[PDB]
């Protein structure tokens, strides 16, 4: 509903591998 | 958590997985994203939790690992729980293949009498406290 669309929140680390 | 109980439909599919031809699908281009939904890498907590739901309800244990089967799992988790499907990688053979994702309590063990090498998913809670992949290969980590 905004602009080029709405943002999604992103993660802060590669929890997949360490962190 | 009950949609976490659309797992039988996934497990079902996970199983059973002058010449005939594959029906090539018509491909649609691109990689859509659903609008506000957060996508993150798999987490220790989720991997542990997922692990356990799986060992309970069954179907993963000693099922035979092919990448085709692997992938149906990953997409399932990607679509329902929003974790990028890069986490279910394992350490290379030959041998037992170890999770690269700390918290994922399944490893790939080879097997002979029932039949490169063939493997099956097998549950190990020790994988939860001992990051075997990292010490086998710190090269992959940091």
């Amino acid at each position: 509903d905004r602009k080029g669309g709405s943002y999604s929140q992103a993660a802060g680390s590669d929890s997949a591998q360490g962190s | 958590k009950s949609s976490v109980i659309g797992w039988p439909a996934v497990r079902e599919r996970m199983r059973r997985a002058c010449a005939w031809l594959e029906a090539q699908e018509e491909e649609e281009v691109g990689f859509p994203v659903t609008p506000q939904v957060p996508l993150r890498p798999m987490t220790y907590k989720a991997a542990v939790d997922l692990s356990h739901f799986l060992k309970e309800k069954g179907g993963l244990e000693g099922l035979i690992h092919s990448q085709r089967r692997q992938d149906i799992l990953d997409l399932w988790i990607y679509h329902t729980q929003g974790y990028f499907p890069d986490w279910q990688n394992y350490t290379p053979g030959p041998g037992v293949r170890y999770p690269l994702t700390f918290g994922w309590c399944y490893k790939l063990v080879p097997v002979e009498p029932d039949k490169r090498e063939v493997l099956e998913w097998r549950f190990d809670s020790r994988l939860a406290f001992h990051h075997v992949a990292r010490e086998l290969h710190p090269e992959y980590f940091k």
Partner: protein, 255 residues
């Protein structure tokens, strides 16, 4: 670039991942050029003097990390905004930087693909010399049904002397632009996996070009997996992210 003493009531970062689809289709219906040219564009609002890291799903990075067997993006002609440390990218694939304040562009990349063009256009053309001309064009959206292009504009050349335009179309709107010797078919909202038809004739060589935007989409599969922020103070900071595809240079040849 960075200076000291910056301060916000709320610490956040936004990333716009923007991909621009290049196309050249020869008159025959065969593809000369298919290319994605992307950039990552950032609005930064971060107090103090933080330290950023950008995880992408980067084929190499995955290959070196035992994650190779995963779906990735093998991404060419990579070039970085200044503040990015390369010594780290060179060895690690790590994207490491102290970001400027607010709007700036973090990186650019290129891709090659032969893959169905997002929007396909066939125009058939019947000309009766010195008498009249007819246009039957069909626009077809070849991307996922559940996505939707916006503000799609199709530009087709008509002859610098044609007159008396007439057209019909089930979806959208067609107009004459004499000054550019073109007709312009504009569909405001264009769902994927669809075929639309517009008819035009007049009376009595540059390519058909289209313009479109697709939110919540990429053609490359590029994921921004995470963005790490370190600042000395216990810092509560949130990154935000969107993907946008758009046309850049997209043309069907005509003759």
């Amino acid at each position: 670039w960075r200076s000291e003493g910056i301060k916000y009531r709320k610490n956040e970062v936004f990333l716009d991942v923007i991909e621009a689809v290049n196309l050249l289709v020869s008159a025959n219906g065969n593809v000369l050029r298919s290319e994605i040219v992307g950039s990552i564009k950032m609005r930064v609002f971060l107090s103090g003097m933080p330290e950023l890291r950008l995880g992408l799903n980067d084929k190499v990075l995955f290959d070196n990390t035992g994650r190779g067997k995963s779906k990735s993006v093998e991404l060419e002609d990579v070039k970085f905004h200044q503040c990015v440390r390369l010594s780290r990218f060179e060895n690690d694939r790590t994207i490491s930087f102290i970001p400027p304040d607010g709007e700036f562009e973090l990186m650019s990349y290129r891709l090659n693909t032969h893959v169905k063009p997002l929007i396909w256009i066939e125009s058939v053309i019947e000309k009766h010399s010195h008498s009249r001309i007819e246009y039957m064009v069909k626009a077809k959206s070849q991307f996922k049904r559940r996505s939707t292009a916006n503000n799609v504009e199709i530009h087709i050349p008509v002859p610098n002397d044609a007159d008396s335009p007439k057209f019909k179309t089930t979806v959208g709107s067609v107009k004459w632009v004499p000054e550019n010797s073109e007709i312009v078919w504009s569909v405001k909202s264009f769902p994927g996996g669809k075929e639309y038809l517009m008819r035009a004739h007049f009376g009595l060589k540059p390519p058909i070009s289209v313009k479109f935007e697709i939110p919540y989409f990429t053609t490359s599969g590029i994921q921004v997996r995470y963005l790490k922020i370190i600042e000395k103070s216990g810092y509560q900071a949130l990154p935000w992210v969107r993907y946008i595809t758009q046309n850049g240079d997209y043309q069907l040849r005509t003759q």
